């Protein structure tokens, strides 16, 4: 669990994003597949072409997931356990990759929330997405 401050800052940031959450999510993904091509291998069927509805539609699935994460920041292990088993077991996603998306999410938020993305926020967010990635890999333990 993050500091009461970190939470406020996250839900605050999540607040601004709001409707764009779905959008941003997909950008973060496209950003990932581009800067670190090895992550595309986890999405065979998906034709990851810019504008790719599969990636946009999925950039929506992660966004919602993260939102659900914020709802239960006080208890992420349970809220996400579902995604854990999937990503860890079923999918077998290399843990380094969870760090890669996170950084890509941040770059996404910075490029769309100019004066919103302060050092404090950047820290509450990187700290939030860390907990998130900590949880999604919990099943390798």
């Amino acid at each position: 669990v993050l500091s009461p401050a970190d939470k406020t800052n996250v839900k605050a940031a999540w607040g601004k994003v709001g409707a764009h959450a779905g959008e941003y999510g997909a950008e973060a993904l496209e950003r990932m597949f581009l800067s670190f091509p090895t992550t595309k291998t986890y999405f065979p069927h998906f034709d990851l072409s810019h504008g790719s509805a599969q990636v946009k539609g999925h950039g929506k699935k992660v966004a919602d997931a993260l939102t659900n994460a914020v709802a239960h920041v006080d208890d992420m292990p349970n809220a996400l356990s579902a995604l854990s088993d999937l990503h860890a077991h079923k999918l077998r996603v290399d843990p380094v990759n969870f760090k890669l998306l996170s950084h890509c999410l941040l770059v996404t938020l910075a490029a769309h929330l100019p004066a919103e993305f302060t050092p404090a926020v950047h820290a509450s967010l990187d700290k939030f997405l860390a907990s998130v990635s900590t949880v999604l890999t919990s099943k390798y333990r």
Binding site: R31, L106, V107, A110, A111, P119, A120, H122
Partner: protein
Amino acid sequence: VHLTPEEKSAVTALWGKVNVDEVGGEALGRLLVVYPWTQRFFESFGDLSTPDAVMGNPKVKAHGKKVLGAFSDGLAHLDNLKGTFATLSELHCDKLHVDPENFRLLGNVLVCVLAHHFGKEFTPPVQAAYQKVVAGVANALAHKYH
């Protein structure tokens, strides 16, 4: 360390508009603020207990541009970062003992700082072009380790 013809343009064109006095310290400040354990190496800088105290710190800005200068010294030696950061490696590796991982950490912070500033002009591809350069500098600066 590999930037296609159009990858190189985006990079060196973006780097053109970079406030060589700003970015520098904002990345080192955000590094100090986001990954706190890094403060251990900059204790002679003063009180870094508050983001504000960190960002505004005179030293963090002074050495911040010093670093941004080494990154520029990289986009001017893209082919041989191997040696460009050689001594800079012994300093960080043999003297300061900074774990190599953080070199990559700082790199991404720089990329956030950039994404921060140029907003949209910092498209996924250009970000990807930069991810490569930081990817190298970090490696080249860790040379005295591996």
